[PDB]
């Protein structure tokens, strides 16, 4: 099933070849080229009809490999209709090579459908929450004011940020010109900052309401909640629009200047100061507040069990009941999902400031998509109340 190429036959066997053909450049002296040979025998049989495996011995046929810039061996070039679709320079296992071939044979279609469901979950989920709070008199509580702030931030992520994001990934270029690149980038940072800062404010709201319910009623008014909400949006604006629209975020580097001059380029390139300052204000200060606050809810509940056991006069030791285990799960989901979604992106974002070439561009963009996924998660996490569930069923006919 494997074709054994020469220099003469290469144009007919590979460039003029029907469909997909995987070219292996190997040598009799190269130990990593012997290691892959028995894996390509299995792939030639298992991927029958999907691709053709072709082998070229570099010792016998030295003339072909320089034309495609072969620096190391074994190198596997997948060809599609006279052109090199995908490249590698290292030896692999059968399992790792199966994944590479599956990814490049199917023309990235999974990638595009996965953006579509993300937009659908974010818009459906958040419209349903704003509707539920807006329609139902019982849901218009002080907490649900902060939930409404969050719901709007995540909604604008689904309607405007993720779509224009999706297009830049698909087309590989920015079609809407320099201004809308700057406006879209500002709208991204605004809504992500507003979302994550409002998660932090919700943590503080629930902590006061749980640990200090009578102090919370007098201390947290509707007027004070409005001021807090307005402050989070004001901060979000002054970190997003003010720096991006006035070009303060701009790096001086000439490779960066080519992206700022070209309307087709909408790469997110920041100076060190903006990358740090925006990351701290959007994520790390909110994350530390949420860790500190939700820890004091755990400590309070644990210490309150100590008060119950102390007051027994050594009669009963309390164990975790259903209510405590559910509470501890809810705490797990809040910190778990928020951190999983946004820590990788903001960790990588601070790592680029130190050494630029360490983390690839795909990983950076992929982690930013994982952050956008949090906007779909937040309705699921923060709107589980019986009153929410009643209203959701009432709105769905």
């Amino acid at each position, epitope marked *: 099933k494997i074709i054994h190429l020469t220099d003469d036959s290469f144009d007919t066997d590979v460039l003029k070849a029907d469909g997909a053909i995987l070219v292996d450049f190997w040598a009799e002296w190269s130990g990593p080229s012997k290691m892959i040979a028995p894996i390509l025998d299995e792939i030639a049989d298992e991927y029958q009809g999907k691709l053709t495996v072709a082998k070229l011995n570099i010792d016998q046929n030295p003339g072909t490999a320089p034309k495609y810039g072969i620096r190391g061996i074994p190198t596997l070039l997948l060809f599609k209709n006279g052109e090199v679709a995908a490249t590698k320079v290292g030896a692999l296992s059968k399992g790792q090579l199966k994944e590479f071939l599956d990814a490049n044979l199917a023309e990235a279609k999974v990638m595009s459908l996965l953006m579509a469901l993300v937009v659908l979950l974010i818009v459906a989920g958040n419209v349903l929450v704003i509707a539920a709070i807006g329609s139902t008199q019982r849901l218009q509580t002080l907490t649900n004011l902060f939930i409404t702030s969050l719901a709007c931030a995540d909604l604008v992520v689904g309607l405007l940020v993720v779509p224009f994001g999706a297009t830049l990934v698909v087309r590989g270029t920015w079609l809407w010109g320099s201004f809308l690149c700057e406006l879209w980038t500002s709208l991204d940072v605004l809504c992500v900052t507003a979302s994550i800062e409002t998660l932090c404010v919700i943590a503080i709201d629930r902590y006061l309401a749980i640990t200090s319910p*009578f102090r919370y009623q007098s201390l947290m008014t509707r007027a004070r909640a409005k001021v807090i909400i307005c402050t989070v949006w004001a901060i979000s604006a002054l970190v997003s629009f003010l720096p991006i629209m006035m070009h303060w975020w701009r790096d001086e580097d000439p490779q960066a200047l080519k992206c700022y001059q070209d309307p087709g380029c909408c790469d997110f390139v920041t100076n060190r100061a903006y990358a740090i300052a925006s990351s701290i204000i959007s994520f790390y200060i909110p994350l530390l507040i949420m860790i500190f606050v939700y820890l004091r809810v755990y400590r309070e509940a644990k210490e309150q069990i100590r008060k119950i056991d102390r007051a*027994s006069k050594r009669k009963t030791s309390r164990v975790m*009941a259903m*209510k405590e285990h559910k*509470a501890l799960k*809810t705490l797990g989901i809040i910190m778990g999902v928020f951190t999983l979604c946004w820590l990788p992106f903001f960790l990588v974002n601070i790592v680029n400031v130190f050494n630029r070439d360490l983390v690839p561009d795909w990983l950076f963009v992929a982690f930013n998509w994982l952050g956008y996924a949090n906007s779909a998660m937040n309705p699921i*996490i923060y709107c*589980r*109340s019986p009153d929410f569930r009643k209203a959701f069923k009432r709105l769905l006919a």
Partner: nanobody
Amino acid sequence: VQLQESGGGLVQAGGSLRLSCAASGSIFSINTMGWYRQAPGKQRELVAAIHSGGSTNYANSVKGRFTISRDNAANTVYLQMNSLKPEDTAVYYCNVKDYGAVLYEYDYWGQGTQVTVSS
């Protein structure tokens, strides 16, 4: 979770009663146990409430007269009601606000125990 109410009934004006509510069932460590009342032809209103943390909150009508406390170990809340007036006549309800959901509170209500103060 069941809220069993005792201690109510008939008492002369100037007299005292002691309501007790024993909450049998799974409640989160952090909670607020309380006494609400509904007088005839009025809406339900908070009498008194005591947080797990030991904070208290009383209606101005019952300040100085009524004292709310909870049992040191058990989920049992006591409203000692002194200097009772015919104004205080009402169906008194035990309430437990459980905070185990973290993002919302769950309400439990007692059936309610009649208190009638005569002049």
